[PDB]
Design a protein around this nucleic acid. Structure first.
Ligand SMILES: Nc1nc2c(ncn2[C@@H]2O[C@H](COP(=O)(O)OP(=O)(O)NP(=O)(O)O)[C@@H](O)[C@H]2O)c(=O)[nH]1
Ligand SMILES: N[C@@H](Cc1ccccc1)C(=O)O
Ligand SMILES: [Mg+2]
Ligand SMILES: [Mg+2]
Ligand SMILES: [Mg+2]
Ligand SMILES: [Mg+2]
Ligand SMILES: [Mg+2]
Ligand SMILES: [Mg+2]
Ligand SMILES: [Mg+2]
Ligand SMILES: [Mg+2]
Ligand SMILES: [Mg+2]
Ligand SMILES: [Mg+2]
Ligand SMILES: [Mg+2]
Ligand SMILES: [Mg+2]
Ligand SMILES: [Mg+2]
Ligand SMILES: [Mg+2]
Ligand SMILES: [Mg+2]
Ligand SMILES: [Mg+2]
Ligand SMILES: [Mg+2]
Ligand SMILES: [Mg+2]
Ligand SMILES: [Mg+2]
Ligand SMILES: [Mg+2]
Ligand SMILES: [Mg+2]
Ligand SMILES: [Mg+2]
Ligand SMILES: [Mg+2]
Ligand SMILES: [Mg+2]
Ligand SMILES: [Mg+2]
Ligand SMILES: [Mg+2]
Ligand SMILES: [Mg+2]
Ligand SMILES: [Mg+2]
Ligand SMILES: [Mg+2]
Ligand SMILES: [Mg+2]
Ligand SMILES: [Mg+2]
Ligand SMILES: [Mg+2]
Ligand SMILES: [Mg+2]
Ligand SMILES: [Mg+2]
Ligand SMILES: [Mg+2]
Ligand SMILES: [Mg+2]
Ligand SMILES: [Mg+2]
Ligand SMILES: [Mg+2]
Ligand SMILES: [Mg+2]
Ligand SMILES: [Mg+2]
Ligand SMILES: [Mg+2]
Ligand SMILES: [Mg+2]
Ligand SMILES: [Mg+2]
Ligand SMILES: [Mg+2]
Ligand SMILES: [Mg+2]
Ligand SMILES: [Mg+2]
Ligand SMILES: [Mg+2]
Ligand SMILES: [Mg+2]
Ligand SMILES: [Mg+2]
Ligand SMILES: [Mg+2]
Ligand SMILES: [Mg+2]
Ligand SMILES: [Mg+2]
Ligand SMILES: [Mg+2]
Ligand SMILES: [Mg+2]
Ligand SMILES: [Mg+2]
Ligand SMILES: [Mg+2]
Ligand SMILES: [Mg+2]
Ligand SMILES: [Mg+2]
Ligand SMILES: [Mg+2]
Ligand SMILES: [Mg+2]
Ligand SMILES: [Mg+2]
Ligand SMILES: [Mg+2]
Ligand SMILES: [Mg+2]
Ligand SMILES: [Mg+2]
Ligand SMILES: [Mg+2]
Ligand SMILES: [Mg+2]
Ligand SMILES: [Mg+2]
Ligand SMILES: [Mg+2]
Ligand SMILES: [Mg+2]
Ligand SMILES: [Mg+2]
Ligand SMILES: [Mg+2]
Ligand SMILES: [Mg+2]
Ligand SMILES: [Mg+2]
Ligand SMILES: [Mg+2]
Ligand SMILES: [Mg+2]
Ligand SMILES: [Mg+2]
Ligand SMILES: [Mg+2]
Ligand SMILES: [Mg+2]
Ligand SMILES: [Mg+2]
Ligand SMILES: [Mg+2]
Ligand SMILES: [Mg+2]
Ligand SMILES: [Mg+2]
Ligand SMILES: [Mg+2]
Ligand SMILES: [Mg+2]
Ligand SMILES: [Mg+2]
Ligand SMILES: [Mg+2]
Ligand SMILES: [Mg+2]
Ligand SMILES: [Mg+2]
Ligand SMILES: [Mg+2]
Ligand SMILES: [Mg+2]
Ligand SMILES: [Mg+2]
Ligand SMILES: [Mg+2]
Ligand SMILES: [Mg+2]
Ligand SMILES: [Mg+2]
Ligand SMILES: [Mg+2]
Ligand SMILES: [Mg+2]
Ligand SMILES: [Mg+2]
Ligand SMILES: [Mg+2]
Ligand SMILES: [Mg+2]
Ligand SMILES: [Mg+2]
Ligand SMILES: [Mg+2]
Ligand SMILES: [Mg+2]
Ligand SMILES: [Mg+2]
Ligand SMILES: [Mg+2]
Ligand SMILES: [Mg+2]
Ligand SMILES: [Mg+2]
Ligand SMILES: [Mg+2]
Ligand SMILES: [Mg+2]
Ligand SMILES: [Mg+2]
Ligand SMILES: [Mg+2]
Ligand SMILES: [Mg+2]
Ligand SMILES: [Mg+2]
Ligand SMILES: [Mg+2]
Ligand SMILES: [Mg+2]
Ligand SMILES: [Mg+2]
Ligand SMILES: [Mg+2]
Ligand SMILES: [Mg+2]
Ligand SMILES: [Mg+2]
Ligand SMILES: [Mg+2]
Ligand SMILES: [Mg+2]
Ligand SMILES: [Mg+2]
Ligand SMILES: [Mg+2]
Ligand SMILES: [Mg+2]
Ligand SMILES: [Mg+2]
Ligand SMILES: [Mg+2]
Ligand SMILES: [Mg+2]
Ligand SMILES: [Mg+2]
Ligand SMILES: [Mg+2]
Ligand SMILES: [Mg+2]
Ligand SMILES: [Mg+2]
Ligand SMILES: [Mg+2]
Ligand SMILES: [Mg+2]
Ligand SMILES: [Mg+2]
Ligand SMILES: [Mg+2]
Ligand SMILES: [Mg+2]
Ligand SMILES: [Mg+2]
Ligand SMILES: [Mg+2]
Ligand SMILES: [Mg+2]
Ligand SMILES: [Mg+2]
Ligand SMILES: [Mg+2]
Ligand SMILES: [Mg+2]
Ligand SMILES: [Mg+2]
Ligand SMILES: [Mg+2]
Ligand SMILES: [Mg+2]
Ligand SMILES: [Mg+2]
Ligand SMILES: [Mg+2]
Ligand SMILES: [Mg+2]
Ligand SMILES: [Mg+2]
Ligand SMILES: [Mg+2]
Ligand SMILES: [Mg+2]
Ligand SMILES: [Mg+2]
Ligand SMILES: [Mg+2]
Ligand SMILES: [Mg+2]
Ligand SMILES: [Mg+2]
Ligand SMILES: [Mg+2]
Ligand SMILES: [Mg+2]
Ligand SMILES: [Mg+2]
Ligand SMILES: [Mg+2]
Ligand SMILES: [Mg+2]
Ligand SMILES: [Mg+2]
Ligand SMILES: [Mg+2]
Ligand SMILES: [Mg+2]
Ligand SMILES: [Mg+2]
Ligand SMILES: [Mg+2]
Ligand SMILES: [Mg+2]
Ligand SMILES: [Mg+2]
Ligand SMILES: [Mg+2]
Ligand SMILES: [Mg+2]
Ligand SMILES: [Mg+2]
Ligand SMILES: [Mg+2]
Ligand SMILES: [Mg+2]
Ligand SMILES: [Mg+2]
Ligand SMILES: [Mg+2]
Ligand SMILES: [Mg+2]
Ligand SMILES: [Mg+2]
Ligand SMILES: [Mg+2]
Ligand SMILES: [Mg+2]
Ligand SMILES: [Mg+2]
Ligand SMILES: [Mg+2]
Ligand SMILES: [Mg+2]
Ligand SMILES: [Mg+2]
Ligand SMILES: [Mg+2]
Ligand SMILES: [Mg+2]
Ligand SMILES: [Mg+2]
Ligand SMILES: [Mg+2]
Ligand SMILES: [Mg+2]
Ligand SMILES: [Mg+2]
Ligand SMILES: [Mg+2]
Ligand SMILES: [Mg+2]
Ligand SMILES: [Mg+2]
Ligand SMILES: [Mg+2]
Ligand SMILES: [Mg+2]
Ligand SMILES: [Mg+2]
Ligand SMILES: [Mg+2]
Ligand SMILES: [Mg+2]
Ligand SMILES: [Mg+2]
Ligand SMILES: [Mg+2]
Ligand SMILES: [Mg+2]
Ligand SMILES: [Mg+2]
Ligand SMILES: [Mg+2]
Ligand SMILES: [Mg+2]
Ligand SMILES: [Mg+2]
Ligand SMILES: [Mg+2]
Ligand SMILES: [Mg+2]
Ligand SMILES: [Mg+2]
Ligand SMILES: [Mg+2]
Ligand SMILES: [Mg+2]
Lengths: 82, 393, 60, 85, 205
RNA sequence: GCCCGGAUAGCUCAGUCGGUAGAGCAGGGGAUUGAAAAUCCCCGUGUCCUUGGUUCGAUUCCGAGUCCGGGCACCA
RNA sequence: AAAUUGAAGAGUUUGAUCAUGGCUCAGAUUGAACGCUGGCGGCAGGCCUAACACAUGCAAGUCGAACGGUAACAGGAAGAAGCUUGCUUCUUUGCUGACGAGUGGCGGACGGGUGAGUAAUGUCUGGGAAACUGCCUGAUGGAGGGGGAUAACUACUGGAAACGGUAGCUAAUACCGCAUAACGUCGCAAGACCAAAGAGGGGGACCUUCGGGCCUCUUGCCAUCGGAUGUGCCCAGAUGGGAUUAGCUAGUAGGUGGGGUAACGGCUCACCUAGGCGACGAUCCCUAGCUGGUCUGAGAGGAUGACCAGCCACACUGGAACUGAGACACGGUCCAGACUCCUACGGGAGGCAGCAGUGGGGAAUAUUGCACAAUGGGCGCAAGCCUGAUGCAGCCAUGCCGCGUGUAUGAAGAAGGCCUUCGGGUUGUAAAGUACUUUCAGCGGGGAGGAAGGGAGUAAAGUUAAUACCUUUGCUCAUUGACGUUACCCGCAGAAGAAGCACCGGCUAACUCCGUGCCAGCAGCCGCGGUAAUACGGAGGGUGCAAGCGUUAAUCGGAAUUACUGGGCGUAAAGCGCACGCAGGCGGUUUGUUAAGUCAGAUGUGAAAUCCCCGGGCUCAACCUGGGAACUGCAUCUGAUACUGGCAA
């Protein structure tokens, strides 16, 4: 099963997640098909915070790829009309 | 290493003293089987007190073995000393930690040369109390012969400066109590009563900072190097900073579990024999004689002034003068060490039976402070007691 | 191998376990090592002040 | 061993007792056709083929045998019946 | 981390006045400058080509108060940056906060300005800064916080800055201890004495 | 934790059963050379591993140690 | 708009010289070690050697919404008995919630670890058909009617234990028929043949025989054709060293036919032919995980493959298969072997190259910590449980990077040291002294951000006979942090707690004086020391780095000293003693003509990280991070014909 999940990079106490389309069996930081945006929880109100390319999500979710508990919330965060 | 040791009943360090082949080790075995059966503690046996090839083909004991027998009032911790003339060095370590001895004189042979040598070492080191035990009895079926030996022991103790006539002498066979004779089982149950009555609750130093002299080092397969010894002062909590000071140099370390006869502890209090497990130390690099101190409290020294009291023929020591360059053995807390003597100006010779101060350069540095008590020995016998005056290094 | 004993005076004799580093002396032909003064049974040089990491001596 | 999922040891042993018996049954019905092949006309061989055809297809559906295994034992075995007889 | 030794000794060895012990008084005349580096001060040096490079490097270090490890890092940034390697070396040094705080006149010496930066006095763009090495970006506003504003060391040290040349690239208010760093410093604006070319020559080999 | 061996002037070795230890090879002093090497003329240059004891007297006889050698064990 | 801005020499053969040519040195760099000295912090890292041997706890379970269990356990409900009639005793009740032990599902094959083997079975780059694919996901349509078992539990025994047997007994999504089946499988087609499992949340109406049936809805089950993701297999080139290894090879090389493989194949057989590889290095021997990269370099190259990422390989040693969608299975099974193991002598264990930790080896390398709070993973509708994966914490200057250790004034140019032509100089504004700070430690108080959620509510929607239940939801509640005495802030006290260690003859920045006398010692190269040492030892003085500094080892550089870019061979090292000559390298000249080379274009690809440039975020930096460029390539496809090749003439 392909799944859209966060990768967890960044320094100690300073996380930075690469949301990424990968196989369930592969490790968190390991193999993936292609990365599809990112997430930064320690960004705060500034220029950049969270980006998520919604065109590539239709190629995976439309076919048959699950979305993780956190990445599903960021699709709600980016919104369809807000 | 599983069952947690509950801190109930005061801890007391007991141990057997006496002549060679006199019932000293066999007494220890009798005390276990007697106290385990009636009260209902842990059993154990005689063979465990001394196995190895060295204590089987021979029969004699070398190593200071330990035993843990419990009674309603107190929790005793035994120290079975060797006894022979060859093994006085590893005895003194066992005798120093011991609070109240159990002397062993026998009704057939009576007081013999080592009994005098053992009690002499007991005084100068630190043996407050002592209890006699006649360890044959049955072999000579007589009322007059057995009681004449009791008289000579009272004389021995009182001559060498102990209470003597006040000490509770006990009679009883060690081998008869090993099997199951009702009269002889009860007579060594009586010795447990004499231990509670005569010896008081010992005075500990649970206030001034941590110190622990190492009596014997181990290497436990799985956990690491362990050091045993009575905690001279202070306490030991698990995961605390501990500095090892003495011979060679000085090394930083941390405690990772204290124990009491293969049982876990939280706080290793003062005045009780405990096995401290140190972190990241090899078997060879940590040797016997070194002390587990709290960092900063004590510093290793190779030179010091000290008020030495030399002994005379009557008290038992040297009987001739000596000059700078003389090298005897200085027994501090556990181990001994050799050192050159440098006398003060205006003192041509040191006569026997005299009070003087002197600078002593030791070959190995040992951890010491001002007001530490030591006993000088040389040539298989005592020489002089004393105290440390000033640090130099 | 043979190894040079630098500094003035040494405690080495018969046996005594010592540490060896690389370095030719360029005078004794064949001797192509140096004993590390301070490490193991090889002690420091007695009464040195200048250059004491070389020769393994502590502060005064 | 040092695990409570040793059920799979006794469960897999329990499987192959069953799994070998249904497998052994299948390959004997296939042997029954190869026995009929050699000295025989188109009559006895095709009777054995009609008997094993339901058994080989069935065992393929249960995941014992793969569907291509079953497909060959029809493909090659019909070719022995058709070419010789 | 810092020098913290005899400071005017460094000036005699180098020869020229390094502004290490500039302080309240203008001119020193209290060290036998030039002709006494040490005991053997009367010894005229032969001074090789490697010497003059090393002397010029050690001069620029000791003026700005930077060690070789951090100074060699300025060269590595200076090489990668555009323009000229020589001009980049010194432009990056001048952009330090302890150097800017000195040039504004909030510190008699550069070591005083460094301590003033380190001890939570200095504040830039509404944010306190402790780091002397803080690269002051173009268009900034360094200043002193209101708790430590108009303390005894700063008011006297600001009167010294009137006698100084005063840079064109930065401006100072002087009333409320508020500075304004505007553009990057030009080569011809400052110094006109410390050679950059010889420092580029030391590191390239 | 205990059994055993080993140590003699700068180096390699003799000498002892209490009678106070020597040999070569070095090293040093002088005449000679810038200093040497030889040449010539004179010297052991010593805590008998350390220290104590039995004695009139101990390298030598008997303890206790030093660092090193090899041997056997104990698992809070 | 930005993506390379890049190439240094010096000492040393000689009385001197120019050349040749080694030797050494100045720079980067590390998984480092060692010596001396050690304040903090931040981010990284931390058994390279014995793939040596291992005690202890722990690293994989999970659902009651599969099933018997009316339950091992703890607790409500119809009813019971004592007596302080609600306090106590106590049988029934899926019936209180759940769940010890089972039975079945899915997991255990992922995640972790380590490079022993492997020089090609492997890896890389680019292609290619003969394939399979649990979970996810498109479509179509099923799922109908039966049976015999079987554990647990008893019952009864065997065993020291591990672990059984014998008598029942019973449940299912376990199990097997049967009907049922096609664009499915097979056949030339006609034909034949091939499956399923059921659950849970609610109900008006009417059957009640009360176990309700039947509407409901979510989820599962089953067949096919599919996507997606994995994996299996094939080819081409590339991927170390040795010819003081020259021949190797019989299922070997190919065919026909049978078997077997998910799939094709000497995969494997039977016969048939006599091959196949080999000088563009087979075979044999030694060494080796491989790549993205790393370090170095002006670049070509040279070295290297710790950490992060992909692939392979292996799991106590040597084998085999079972189960499964996937293993010939790290914490499964079965044998055998070596070593530890416990017993009752019958027999049993056991597998740290999961995480801690031990001994041993070594120059050398760490806690038997906390936590699932986040991020993934496993099962489950979920809640949650599980997780040494991950996130933290401890230790270690092992690195990279930041801030420390005061800051002004200060002449008697003090004392003391050190030097002197004894006039003085120098240490030295150094110190003391006065003026000030108060970072960081040390105390005392504020306090984020890592937190998205999940639940009890609800609202309309969803959904239906229904103002239900689930799908989506938006509003009200009270909560979720191992880190944590957190990041950071603010008050306190007072310079207070906070500096070494190399070197100083030349190369190479910096000099005197004493001690010693080819001795003691130094030395990276040359070389210093023989009684006036700048080189030895100390002292003063300096210089260079500074919480580091040096020494050692290791790679490249300089070395144009293996030279493709870029060297030579009369006398310095170096033309075989001289011919002939096959294979091989090269080839006059003009027409053709292809298009192999070559060149141009175009598309696909060259994983991500790394590097590089412009940004951005941590007080700054290292560090993290967005986008770009790049990934110098390889493939195919279209062209160009000058050159080179081919084929003619
Ligand atoms: N007849 C008899 N013999 C006894 C008695 N107690 C002890 N013994 C014997 O005396 C001998 C001494 O043995 P043991 O006690 O081990 O010696 P020890 O007293 O420890 N001295 P060491 O350890 O120095 O040899 C043994 O043979 C023992 O059986 C007793 O009461 N009666
Ligand atoms: N305290 C220890 C004493 C001991 C020491 C050494 C051996 C045995 C016992 C117990 O155990
Ligand atoms: Mg894989
Ligand atoms: Mg937020
Ligand atoms: Mg006797
Ligand atoms: Mg005994
Ligand atoms: Mg005896
Ligand atoms: Mg007798
Ligand atoms: Mg007698
Ligand atoms: Mg440890
Ligand atoms: Mg097993
Ligand atoms: Mg088994
Ligand atoms: Mg099955
Ligand atoms: Mg069969
Ligand atoms: Mg069969
Ligand atoms: Mg049929
Ligand atoms: Mg089945
Ligand atoms: Mg199946
Ligand atoms: Mg630094
Ligand atoms: Mg720094
Ligand atoms: Mg260069
Ligand atoms: Mg001579
Ligand atoms: Mg002479
Ligand atoms: Mg002479
Ligand atoms: Mg002479
Ligand atoms: Mg003369
Ligand atoms: Mg001489
Ligand atoms: Mg470049
Ligand atoms: Mg050169
Ligand atoms: Mg040169
Ligand atoms: Mg020559
Ligand atoms: Mg030369
Ligand atoms: Mg010359
Ligand atoms: Mg020349
Ligand atoms: Mg180190
Ligand atoms: Mg070190
Ligand atoms: Mg060390
Ligand atoms: Mg730190
Ligand atoms: Mg870390
Ligand atoms: Mg390893
Ligand atoms: Mg192995
Ligand atoms: Mg092992
Ligand atoms: Mg065990
Ligand atoms: Mg184990
Ligand atoms: Mg536990
Ligand atoms: Mg476990
Ligand atoms: Mg239920
Ligand atoms: Mg339910
Ligand atoms: Mg299944
Ligand atoms: Mg793995
Ligand atoms: Mg990992
Ligand atoms: Mg891994
Ligand atoms: Mg491991
Ligand atoms: Mg690797
Ligand atoms: Mg490939
Ligand atoms: Mg490829
Ligand atoms: Mg490809
Ligand atoms: Mg399918
Ligand atoms: Mg399945
Ligand atoms: Mg699922
Ligand atoms: Mg689906
Ligand atoms: Mg469907
Ligand atoms: Mg029907
Ligand atoms: Mg029917
Ligand atoms: Mg039915
Ligand atoms: Mg039925
Ligand atoms: Mg049935
Ligand atoms: Mg039945
Ligand atoms: Mg049955
Ligand atoms: Mg049934
Ligand atoms: Mg089924
Ligand atoms: Mg029918
Ligand atoms: Mg039928
Ligand atoms: Mg039917
Ligand atoms: Mg029908
Ligand atoms: Mg039909
Ligand atoms: Mg049909
Ligand atoms: Mg049909
Ligand atoms: Mg078909
Ligand atoms: Mg067909
Ligand atoms: Mg049809
Ligand atoms: Mg059915
Ligand atoms: Mg079924
Ligand atoms: Mg049901
Ligand atoms: Mg129901
Ligand atoms: Mg109903
Ligand atoms: Mg569905
Ligand atoms: Mg489904
Ligand atoms: Mg498909
Ligand atoms: Mg599918
Ligand atoms: Mg398969
Ligand atoms: Mg690279
Ligand atoms: Mg580089
Ligand atoms: Mg470069
Ligand atoms: Mg080059
Ligand atoms: Mg390689
Ligand atoms: Mg390699
Ligand atoms: Mg490496
Ligand atoms: Mg590794
Ligand atoms: Mg790591
Ligand atoms: Mg790792
Ligand atoms: Mg990896
Ligand atoms: Mg692969
Ligand atoms: Mg593969
Ligand atoms: Mg494998
Ligand atoms: Mg494997
Ligand atoms: Mg393993
Ligand atoms: Mg195996
Ligand atoms: Mg195997
Ligand atoms: Mg499966
Ligand atoms: Mg199978
Ligand atoms: Mg399959
Ligand atoms: Mg496994
Ligand atoms: Mg296996
Ligand atoms: Mg695995
Ligand atoms: Mg394991
Ligand atoms: Mg296994
Ligand atoms: Mg066999
Ligand atoms: Mg076996
Ligand atoms: Mg076995
Ligand atoms: Mg491990
Ligand atoms: Mg270890
Ligand atoms: Mg070791
Ligand atoms: Mg270390
Ligand atoms: Mg825990
Ligand atoms: Mg919890
Ligand atoms: Mg989770
Ligand atoms: Mg699930
Ligand atoms: Mg589900
Ligand atoms: Mg667990
Ligand atoms: Mg844990
Ligand atoms: Mg650090
Ligand atoms: Mg270190
Ligand atoms: Mg100070
Ligand atoms: Mg000052
Ligand atoms: Mg001052
Ligand atoms: Mg002061
Ligand atoms: Mg003041
Ligand atoms: Mg303050
Ligand atoms: Mg203040
Ligand atoms: Mg603070
Ligand atoms: Mg505090
Ligand atoms: Mg929230
Ligand atoms: Mg929070
Ligand atoms: Mg929810
Ligand atoms: Mg809810
Ligand atoms: Mg609710
Ligand atoms: Mg609701
Ligand atoms: Mg708090
Ligand atoms: Mg907490
Ligand atoms: Mg103050
Ligand atoms: Mg101070
Ligand atoms: Mg003199
Ligand atoms: Mg002389
Ligand atoms: Mg001489
Ligand atoms: Mg001499
Ligand atoms: Mg030197
Ligand atoms: Mg010469
Ligand atoms: Mg001279
Ligand atoms: Mg002189
Ligand atoms: Mg000289
Ligand atoms: Mg030099
Ligand atoms: Mg010198
Ligand atoms: Mg010197
Ligand atoms: Mg200086
Ligand atoms: Mg200095
Ligand atoms: Mg460093
Ligand atoms: Mg270094
Ligand atoms: Mg090197
Ligand atoms: Mg080269
Ligand atoms: Mg080279
Ligand atoms: Mg040449
Ligand atoms: Mg030629
Ligand atoms: Mg020649
Ligand atoms: Mg030639
Ligand atoms: Mg010729
Ligand atoms: Mg010839
Ligand atoms: Mg050609
Ligand atoms: Mg040609
Ligand atoms: Mg041509
Ligand atoms: Mg040709
Ligand atoms: Mg031509
Ligand atoms: Mg033409
Ligand atoms: Mg033409
Ligand atoms: Mg043409
Ligand atoms: Mg053409
Ligand atoms: Mg054409
Ligand atoms: Mg072409
Ligand atoms: Mg073409
Ligand atoms: Mg064409
Ligand atoms: Mg081409
Ligand atoms: Mg091209
Ligand atoms: Mg092209
Ligand atoms: Mg890339
Ligand atoms: Mg590169
Ligand atoms: Mg920034
Ligand atoms: Mg900024
Ligand atoms: Mg980036
Ligand atoms: Mg990018
Ligand atoms: Mg691009
Ligand atoms: Mg790349
Ligand atoms: Mg590349
Ligand atoms: Mg390309
Ligand atoms: Mg091509
Ligand atoms: Mg083409
Ligand atoms: Mg064409
Ligand atoms: Mg042409
Ligand atoms: Mg041509
Ligand atoms: Mg042509």
């Amino acid at each position: 099963m392909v799944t859209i999940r966060l990768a967890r990079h960044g320094a100690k106490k300073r996380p930075f997640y690469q949301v990424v389309v990968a196989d369930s069996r592969n490790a968190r930081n390991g193999r993936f098909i292609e990365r599809v945006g990112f997430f930064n929880p320690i960004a705060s109100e500034k220029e950049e915070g969270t980006r998520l390319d919604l065109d590539r999500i239709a190629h995976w979710v439309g076919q048959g790829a699950t979305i993780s508990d956190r990445v599903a919330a960021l699709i709600k965060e980016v919104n369809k009309a807000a | 290493s599983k069952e947690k040791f509950e801190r109930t009943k005061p801890h007391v360090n007991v141990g057997t003293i006496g002549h060679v082949d006199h019932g000293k080790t066999t007494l220890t075995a009798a005390i276990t089987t007697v106290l385990a059966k009636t009260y209902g503690g842990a059993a154990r046996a005689f063979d465990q007190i001394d196995n190895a090839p060295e204590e089987k083909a021979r029969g004699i004991t070398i190593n200071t073995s330990h035993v843990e027998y419990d009674t309603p009032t107190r929790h005793y911790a035994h120290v079975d000393c060797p006894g022979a003339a060859d093994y006085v060095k590893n005895m003194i370590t066992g005798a120093a930690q011991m609070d109240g001895a159990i002397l062993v004189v026998a009704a057939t042979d009576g007081p013999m040369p080592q009994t005098r040598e053992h009690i002499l070492l007991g005084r100068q080191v630190g043996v407050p109390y002592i209890i006699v035990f006649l360890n044959k009895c049955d072999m000579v079926d007589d009322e007059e012969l057995l009681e004449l030996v009791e008289m000579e022991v009272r004389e021995l103790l009182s001559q060498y400066d102990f209470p003597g006539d006040d000490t509770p002498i006990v009679r009883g066979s060690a081998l008869k109590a090993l099997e199951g004779d009702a009269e002889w089982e009860a007579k060594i149950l009586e010795l447990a009563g004499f231990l509670d009555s005569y010896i008081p609750e010992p005075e500990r130093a649970i206030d001034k900072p941590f110190l622990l002299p190492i009596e014997d080092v181990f290497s436990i397969s799985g956990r690491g190097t362990v050091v045993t010894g009575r905690v001279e002062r202070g306490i030991i909590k698990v995961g605390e900073e501990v500095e090892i000071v003495g011979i060679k140099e000085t090394q930083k370390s941390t405690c990772t579990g204290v124990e009491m006869f293969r049982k876990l502890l939280d706080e290793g209090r003062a005045g009780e024999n405990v096995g401290v497990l140190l972190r990241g130390i090899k078997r060879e690099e940590i040797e016997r004689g070194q002390v587990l101190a709290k960092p900063g409290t004590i510093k290793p020294h190779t030179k010091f002034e000290s008020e030495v009291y030399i002994l005379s023929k009557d008290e038992g020591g040297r009987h001739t003068p000596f000059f700078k360059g003389y090298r005897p053995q200085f027994y501090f807390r556990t181990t001994d060490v050799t050192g050159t003597i440098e006398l003060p100006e205006g003192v041509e010779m040191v006569m026997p039976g005299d009070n003087i101060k002197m600078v002593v350069t030791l070959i190995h540095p040992i951890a010491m402070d001002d007001g530490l008590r030591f006993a000088i020995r040389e040539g298989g016998r005592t020489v002089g007691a004393g105290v440390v005056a000033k640090v130099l290094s | 191998v043979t190894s040079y004993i630098g500094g003035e005076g040494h405690n080495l004799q018969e046996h005594s376990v010592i540490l060896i580093r690389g370095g030719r002396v360029k005078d004794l032909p064949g001797v192509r090592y140096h004993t590390v003064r301070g490490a193991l049974d090889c002690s420091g040089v007695k009464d040195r002040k200048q250059a004491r990491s070389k020769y393994g001596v502590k502060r005064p | 061993n040092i695990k409570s999922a040793k059920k799979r040891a006794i469960q897999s042993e329990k499987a192959r007792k069953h799994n070998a018996s249904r497998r052994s049954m299948m390959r004997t019905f296939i042997k029954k056709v190869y026995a009929a092949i050699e000295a025989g006309d188109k009559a006895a061989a095709q009777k054995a083929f009609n008997e094993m055809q339901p058994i080989v297809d069935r065992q393929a559906a249960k995941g014992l045998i793969h569907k291509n295994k079953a497909a060959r034992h029809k493909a090659n075995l019909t070719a022995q019946i058709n070419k010789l007889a | 981390a810092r020098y913290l030794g005899p400071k005017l000794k460094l000036s005699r060895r180098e020869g020229t006045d390094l502004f290490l012990k500039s302080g309240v008084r203008a001119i020193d005349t209290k060290c036998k400058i030039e002709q006494a580096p040490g005991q053997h001060g009367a010894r005229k040096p032969r001074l090789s080509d490697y010497g003059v490079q090393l002397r010029e490097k050690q001069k620029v270090r000791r003026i700005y108060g930077v060690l070789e490890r951090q100074f060699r890092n300025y060269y590595k940034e200076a090489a990668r940056l555009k323009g000229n390697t020589g001009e980049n070396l010194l432009a990056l040094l001048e952009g330090r906060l302890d150097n800017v705080v000195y040039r504004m006149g909030f510190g008699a010496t550069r070591a005083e300005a460094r301590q003033l930066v380190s001890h939570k006095a200095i504040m830039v763009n509404g944010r306190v800064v402790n780091i002397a090495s803080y690269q002051v970006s173009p268009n900034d506003v360094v200043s002193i916080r209101e708790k430590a504003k108009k303390q005894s060391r700063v008011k006297a040290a600001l009167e010294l800055a009137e006698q100084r040349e005063k840079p064109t690239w930065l401006e100072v208010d002087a009333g409320k201890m508020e500075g304004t760093f505007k553009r990057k410093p030009e080569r011809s604006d400052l110094s006109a004495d410390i050679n950059e070319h010889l420092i580029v020559e030391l590191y390239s080999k």
